[PDB]
């Protein structure tokens, strides 16, 4: 189950 | 941007026996960047029906792939893996050695 959001660098 | 050259192993999926259906593998690993050309050869000729795994990488960020095709070994047929990568000036060929 993937993390529900990533954040841009 | 020091690029990393692929390690290569060529080998069979199951114990190789003449007349018995099997898979021929070429495992390339430790390379960067990800673009790479891998051919499996039968008597020096490119085998057309070859699949590969989905690109992944190890802890040090270097990539690995498995290339593979069904084959029925015989006593006479010679098999090999031919690899090109930006780090290689000429294609690298590694022969399958079933005596290993």
């Amino acid at each position: 189950n993937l993390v529900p959001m990533v954040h841009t660098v | 941007m020091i690029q990393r050259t692929p390690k290569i192993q060529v080998y069979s999926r199951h114990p190789a026996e003449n007349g018995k259906s099997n898979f021929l593998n070429c495992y390339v690993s430790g390379f960067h960047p990800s673009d790479i050309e891998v051919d499996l050869l039968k008597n020096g000729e490119r085998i057309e029906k070859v699949e590969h795994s989905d690109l992944s990488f190890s802890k040090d960020w270097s990539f690995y792939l498995l290339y593979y095709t069904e084959f029925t070994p015989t006593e006479k047929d010679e098999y090999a893996c031919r690899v090109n990568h930006v780090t290689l000036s000429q294609p690298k060929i590694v022969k399958w050695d079933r005596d290993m």
Binding site: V3 | Y11, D54
Partner: protein
């Protein structure tokens, strides 16, 4: 024994036209269970192990939405990083991300990870305490400040200690027939004469799962590493792994040499000899 869930993501920019090539793969231990490939026609997260096909259409919708979101973040990142590093639009560049969780034999959380690389080098990584960041250089330091302001570590900690471990447990249970089974190495030794005075013994381990294994040689009961060759563990292609280790010995002295095999599937380590 111990278990893990890990996701690996690679985006490679395509100079000249269009979006990057994005490939995502998910693993439980040494078993791939899902993939997404932007070049593939479905544009869906796809199953890669039968036990994940148990999940319903909603799962596939959700994982597809998230993975596409991951892809877009990487797309934007490639441009931001080109700016941070003052690079041209001409060359291809790569971002890689890996995250996941480890649990022990009791399936309780042991540790979590979230690491990010640009062009194959460390960029930024969550530290072991899941509370702060290791930034390799000034560009990554700028990212660190951004991620501190956005409380990204806190969000990741919750996912890693919570959701990650919860769904790992789920997958372990649904895939128990294979995921909780160990496959002990099938071992044999081969022999080759190099010359009249030198021979090679090769100790083989085949058909094992999980991938972790140790193969060693002893001479007269003492560890022997000189004149040995130990190949990288390699996938068989059927979900199992293979490895070997070889030693060069004086012809006629083979009997002094023993191979020792340790693996989770072996209640006690195994010994092989040539004779």
């Amino acid at each position: 024994g111990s278990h893990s869930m890990r996701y690996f993501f690679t985006s490679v920019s395509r100079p000249g036209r269009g979006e990057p090539r994005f490939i995502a793969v998910g693993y439980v231990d040494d078993t791939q269970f899902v993939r997404f490939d932007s070049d593939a026609a479905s544009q869906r997260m796809e199953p890669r192990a039968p036990w994940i096909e148990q999940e319903g259409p909603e799962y596939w919708d959700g994982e597809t939405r998230k993975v596409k979101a991951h892809s877009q973040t990487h797309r934007v990142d490639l441009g931001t990083l080109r700016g941070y590093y003052n690079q041209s639009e001409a060359g291809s560049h790569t971002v890689q991300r890996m995250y996941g969780c480890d649990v022990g034999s009791d399936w309780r959380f042991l540790r979590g990870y979230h690491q990010y690389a640009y062009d194959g080098k460390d960029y930024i990584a969550l530290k072991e305490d899941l509370r702060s960041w290791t930034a390799a250089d000034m560009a990554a330091q700028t990212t660190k400040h951004k991620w501190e302001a956005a409380h990204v570590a806190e969000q990741l900690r919750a996912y890693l200690e919570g959701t990650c471990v919860e769904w790992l447990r789920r997958y372990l249970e649904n895939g128990k027939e294979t995921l909780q089974r160990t496959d002990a190495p099938k071992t044999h030794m081969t022999h080759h004469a190099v010359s009249d005075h030198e021979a090679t013994l090769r100790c083989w381990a085949l058909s094992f799962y999980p991938a972790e294994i140790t193969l060693t040689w002893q001479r007269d009961g003492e560890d022997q590493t000189q004149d040995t060759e130990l190949v990288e563990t390699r996938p068989a292609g059927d979900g199992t792994f293979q490895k070997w280790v070889a030693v060069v010995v004086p012809s006629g002295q083979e009997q002094r040499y023993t191979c020792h095999v340790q693996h989770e599937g072996l209640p006690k380590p195994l010994t092989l000899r040539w004779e």
